[model samples]
Target: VKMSPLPTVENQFTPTTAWSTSVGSGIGNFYSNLHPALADNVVYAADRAGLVKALNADDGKEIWSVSLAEKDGWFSKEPALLSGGVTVSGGHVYIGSEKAQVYALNTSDGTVAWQTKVAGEALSRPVVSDGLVLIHTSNGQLQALNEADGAVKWTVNLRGESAPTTAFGAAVVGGDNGRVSAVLMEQGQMIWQQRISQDRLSDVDTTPVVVNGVVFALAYNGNLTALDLRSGQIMWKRELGSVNDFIVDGNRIYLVDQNDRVMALTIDGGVTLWTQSDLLHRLLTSPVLYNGNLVVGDSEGYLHWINVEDGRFVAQQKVDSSGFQTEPVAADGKLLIQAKDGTVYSITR
Candidate 1:
């Protein structure tokens, strides 16, 4: 199926920047997923160079900053490459490093509460749920740690590890070998597993999108699959390859494929609803549903706003020249986007 061309004239939208600040030298030339996070009126962000800070969500003033490399005593004393984004919950902030350590800090003062060593590099953001912190490691392990003390509770083996989505008392993770597994949230038991593709190179890196009682997993090999939440049964599959994540809004799933095409598919049957390909080859971020529109960022630092119902380009705005790869986040009735050069903008219509 061919995708539609870009609209003749891109719609106009002005970005009112409320405040902006940098996290440090930024992620540099390396690939990192260290997206900024928002919680309780604070914006939490980290840089690949090991600087993590909490900023005031309203004015973008720095609350506190910590250097993970200095705090953790790395031998090289150089900036540690951090990939996993920050996770905040229960008055604590959690972040993982490529050096295989997870640090927990007090949300109020940014002081280290606990730091624990994991088995492998944490390439994905940790998920905090049910008084436990769940982290997926590069070595294919799903570890559950106690939220209070950072103690290990249980660990389960997964062939490949993707950041997980949780629902219905289970954590759903995509494996590297095209396997998707649902494990019990409390005990780390494998509840169900299914292989969606046989292509060894098609890593299921995108986090599964869980809605209602179903889960959607996307693979790099062009397989977009829907599975039953309880039994892990395949409901349907489509040839929609994507590396970035997708969003579920009501009955439709919105995703940006590796080809930079934006698509919407039905949640139940995996039917194609609409496709917008004008932004092909632009290196787009994951699609996000915000303020009644489907929003995505491009490597050129442009934000594309599409009609959530019909995949029409409604508006577009240039955010920065450094570009954006981290997904946009919503907080306090505004949209937050971080450019590669370390500037975080809180934008509104």
Candidate 2:
């Protein structure tokens, strides 16, 4: 898969002509750590207090809000959107206490459609693909459910590990025993397993990005690894300062670290193309590449756009002083950013 970064930042941006609309207020804006999922012109997000709200894509206007805490449970993260008006997996939208209960809700009205009790708390976002919404529980069980009905299709347990990362019809399960296994999603079978590191904290927290047939994953220990998606073969590994989520375009991969350093590397040899410093020291959001521009949010509630070729700064915008671990998602040429303050901002040129 090839993706180009978006257009570079504006020569001059208009102060993010956005407004904050409180939908499920009185819940007291705790930490809405979930990233907003966008489909068509609507964005869906949740709060720690279990408030799920839908907003207009053009403006941050509340369309519907539901308190899922009374139904299923509160969200510790963002819910994954399944088929339209169908289901939201993981991150505590309406999944009955975040203990592996998957809730299907009417996307248009926030009504509960169905709920299924799995075996764990969903920490990572659910993978919705191939008519199956895959849930990775805190206990390391990967379960596949029917998107329309929330029925269990298959379940696989990666015992002794945290939640694994899944995408492109496969999952990379990292074990607390210091092993990373690549499993095929369709068959619920393991393809290959390799011990990446033995450190007790060497958990694969960053999701693996599959590019062309290679899976790129990063560990918390600043080790960036590339592996064959089919065979789980290690292609190369590079050490960095601290790495967050990464983006791949063409032959290059871009990543930002915990020390505010941005890097661009060649995927073929893992060669460093360029590195920029003083960016965001802490990045919890994934970088979006749109029209040759890289857009990312940081822990300081700032949005930055950089040139993809050289990691040059194009534009920077700050939302609040709190923090934002969730990345920005773009729709209809505008950017949707959810802040830690429970306020969502829509930014355009």
Candidate 3:
């Protein structure tokens, strides 16, 4: 499908670049979740070929960079299709790969702390909680490892299996069978499960978001539903499909649907506040909240800002010529945009 051409915006305010730098060769045209992660004043980024780097968020100066290619034997090396992370915590940063392994790097110097094998391809971010690093793999397994030693602690099956959101010592995961469940992080025991997209594609690849005791989950061709967090009981359901993560503010949730329409829905009872179709078929990333406005990047390499109150195009900026597959990340009171070609820009309103 042809992209809907750039939308006209009033350009109320243009964002200024604070600094710009590269994080190795970026993911290029590959579909990657290997975006930047902020830990304090530092930004952690990685590429598909397993090059991880840390940079000073204020000036984009390189703090450290580590090249991680798996050594198969004495003379053979395998490419690590790093995807799941850049997750930093407890003095170490965690990363995973389509090569079915996880690596922990010392945040102080980008040293390899530990490396271990998981059961499946880890294309989702690893969630660290309660002294354990949790990895949700494409093979229908939620694997847990000891954060300090990288020991495989447990593996729980939940038949992509989206990454689990750790909350109140539990992992909330949406399943391939169109069910969302909360599992106790203690031993990978499931607490409760609820069916959301029972009749469609049934693949729940979108990570479930939990807010105020409610869990929101959606499928590629099914309904977006809210469930009671404690019991997995359905609270409300709406006919909306999304594969990307959505953001919530107050009682409203914003998402980019499969059709590339940006929408705002009331979180209370699943009411859509507005749908902005100006950017349809543009292959937008998930909504990123910036400067109190909703922002998203398209395959056309343009960043479009939509007003929060009512979904209307407010501004547009040409960021990268190659395009964006990951959403812009906000960290340490700063907004960051990383293009597909490894260009990192810190923007200010």
Best by TM-score: 3
Worst 10-residue lDDT window, candidate 3: 197-206
What ranges in model 1 sit over 4 Å off? 1-13, 71-76, 159-161, 199-204, 240-243
Model 3 bad stretches (over 4 Å) = 74-76, 159-161, 199-205, 241-243
Q: What is the lDDT of candidate 3?
A: 0.80
Residue-level lDDT of model 2, residues 1-349, one tens digit each, is 1222323455444446365544333113332224566676777766555577878877777788776564334745553322111124432233323445666667768877777888776655666666677676766677877777778888887611134466677877654444567777787787887655533212234556677788777654647778887888888877645564567788888876555467888977458888876453354366777545887776676677777777777777767566565556765666767676656777664
- Of 1 and 3, the candidate ahead on TM-score is 3
Q: What lDDT is obtained when candidate 1 is compared to the true structure?
A: 0.80
Query: Candidate 1: lDDT of 84?
Result: 84
- What's the TM-score of each model vs. the native? 0.92, 0.80, 0.94
Compose the digit string of candidate 3's lDDT tens values, residues 1-349: 6679787778888866788888767887776776788887998888888789899988999999998977776767766889887789999899999989899999999999999999998888888999999998887788889999999988888713367887888888876777777889888887887777752213234688889888888754546778888999988887645544577778898877766878888877457788899988887877788778898888777888889888887788887787877768876778887788877778777
Which candidate order results from sorting by TM-score in descending order? 3, 1, 2
lDDT of each: 0.80, 0.61, 0.80
RMSD of each: 3.1, 6.7, 2.5
lDDT of 1 by residue, 166-249 (tens): 997899988677788999988999999999888432223557878888888876465788899999999888754544457777
The TM-score obtained by model 1 is 0.92
